[PDB]
Ligand binder design. Sequence first.
Ligand SMILES: [Zn+2]
Ligand SMILES: [Zn+2]
Ligand SMILES: [Zn+2]
Lengths: 179, 108, 99, 49, 170, 64, 117, 50
Amino acid sequence: VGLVKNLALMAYISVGSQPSPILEFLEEWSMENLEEISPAAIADATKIFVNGCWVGIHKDPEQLMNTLRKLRRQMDIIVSEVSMIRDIREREIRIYTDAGRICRPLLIVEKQKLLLKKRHIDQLKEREYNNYSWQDLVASGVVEYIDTLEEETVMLAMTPDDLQEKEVAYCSTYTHCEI
Amino acid sequence: LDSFDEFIQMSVQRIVEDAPPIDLQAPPRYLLKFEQIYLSKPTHWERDGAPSPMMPNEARLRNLTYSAPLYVDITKTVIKEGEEQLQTQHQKTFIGKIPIMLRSTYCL
Amino acid sequence: FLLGQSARDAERAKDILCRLEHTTLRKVTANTAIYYDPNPQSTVVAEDQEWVNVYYEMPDFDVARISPWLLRVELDRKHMTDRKLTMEQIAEKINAGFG
Amino acid sequence: SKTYQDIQNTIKKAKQDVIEVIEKAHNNELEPTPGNTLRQTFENQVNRI
Amino acid sequence: RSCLENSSRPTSTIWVSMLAAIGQRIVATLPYIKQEVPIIIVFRALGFVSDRDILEHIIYDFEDPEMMEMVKPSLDEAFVIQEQNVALNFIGSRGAKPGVTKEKRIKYAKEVLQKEMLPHVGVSDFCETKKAYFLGYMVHRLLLAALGRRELDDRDHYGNKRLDLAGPLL
Amino acid sequence: LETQFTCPFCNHEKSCDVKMDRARNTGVISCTVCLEEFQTPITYLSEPVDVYSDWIDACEAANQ
Amino acid sequence: PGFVGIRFCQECNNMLYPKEDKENRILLYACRNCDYQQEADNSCIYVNKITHEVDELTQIIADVSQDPTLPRTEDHPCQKCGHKEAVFFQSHSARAEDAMRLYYVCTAPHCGHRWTE
Amino acid sequence: GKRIPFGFKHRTLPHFIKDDYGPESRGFVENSYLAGLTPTEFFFHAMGGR
Ligand SMILES: [Zn+2]
Ligand SMILES: [Zn+2]
Ligand SMILES: [Zn+2]
């Protein structure tokens, strides 16, 4: 009891990916290497980790995380199974490209609206004719794979009814919605 | 399926390259390098030695192991003195059989 | 279980409670500091010259025997009074323990 | 329907009472009962409600 | 539990621990070394000799005296070893076979520090800055835990776990 | 760790013992077969194997 | 009294240890690796804050205002800039276990202001 | 013997806001079995039955 477990329906486990495209992007995006910094820079910078290696520091972690997410949502140099966690209080950005992470797809919310729109459903309803697929839905930046370690940082609507205006607002800054 | 496909496509080759080349010396000395894997489709060899493609239901009925032969390119170089070396490449040396996951990319 | 009026009056029950429960100096100490305070006549802590001089302007102990290192412990009122404990008793326990 | 309405009213009241106790804790108006840490008094009171 | 990105070796685990005038001393359990080493000796063996240069890897804001007070017992303990060669000798005296010459003990200590300690940070030469920063981060995390400023990790939390599937198992 | 050592002079195994004279900050290693002895300064971190290593180093330093 | 810091030798960056100038009765800070010495500016050598009274407002950082998982309020406006919205949260450091005291941080960009009511 | 723990950082589930000590967050199921549980009530009731 409890020791043997079974996957949830939409759970996917990462197969693993090489980190070098991300290290190459980070060095081209104002990350400073440990061998170059002075230690006095570390107190107000953010530590960047990739697969647990502390690779550098960065001085504006919000714009970095926005850029990294914008890459992942575009099928760019960051593949969909890469986790990217900002610990705001600790000043750590941790990026994971390793195998064996358990993850699941979530819908992206921006400004309290789903990015999923009628034109997506209307394309999916003729999937057998138009060859539009789940992969196109991920490539459009509508669905995102989120790991348990990244869920700590996510704000989840249980349904789009949580996104509506209410007589008292519990939360007004949701990042994702359950399918 | 994806985990098995990553094992066949990437991990076996990495393991074969990551192993150190092996040096032998009595003086004349030899070193061998393992450089490239190949995996066929599942095949079975009958008592006459002829290969044929084994389907999974034959493996279930005859109690066979559904597996494919793995090959590696091996280079041997011979060393002693004067750079009087030579290399022999023993291409596709049969190294063993790998059990194949059904419906994987390497299944029939 | 308590005898007598200590079984009815909560204040006497609390007095026995203080008589049983173990209290070390840590339970009643707010902070501790170590100073180089080489002359009690001109204590490097400013806030306490008014009382310190009263102890040294009398003959019972000799500044020539005083080590220049001071241990200063600050207690707090709530934990002392919750225990009806006095600094005269704390000093008595110190001198009982170290002579 | 009467029973369901009275149940819903009782739940709504209990939730408002928990909100009140939370506000008293946040404002430090909540005073520790003896022998209990403030966290344990808060937990005791919410579980009571 | 350090593992190199390609599995050329199995994982190697490094422990940095705080022991239960008396003060809180921090020690490292390094692989292939028979005894726990004071962390400041490990930093000197990595070539960081002055106390300030070591603390610059462990305490990123110096205006935080509560952390300084907590590293101070370890600077005290290791003060008898002050040069990189003495620290590499100290480490190499342990784990190495007792009879080997000084050069072999130094070389053994360097080999452990390059290849066996924190192989995920690097197994190359000239990686000592990377290793000093990560080992400093390990000590910093331990200090934040001891000061109660960061919560202890949960072994049940599924972010801290991995599922080995058929591929990795084979 | 091992606390008994092979003598560098007489090659007898487990023939050398270390005496840690902490109060004088000095360590003596002595071979029971040949009674060759060596003294080195010791710290509180110092241990028998550090004294033995100091002795082997002093021997190789004398071979120069 | 506040914790007493480390201080470092100018000549060799090892930490200085306090010692008295016995024949002169003044407090030195002296190196154990080299002959450097300095006169102490603070006569306190040790402080033990047994009550561990520490101000969480020093530990809070303004970046926390960016966290989408924190609650937001308009009822407690920022005194430093008048901005209507703030995040709020409880104290995070342990041993201060009892208090449910809220801390507020302004959400206006570059107003890293933090307070308690 | 205690309300549902913060197994996520200061949260029981990523659906709640941090430091939500309120009844729904910490696992008060306000529905009946005839009304049927909401998804968070369902998962907290599974935590209890386990
Ligand atoms: Zn001998
Ligand atoms: Zn110095
Ligand atoms: Zn403001």
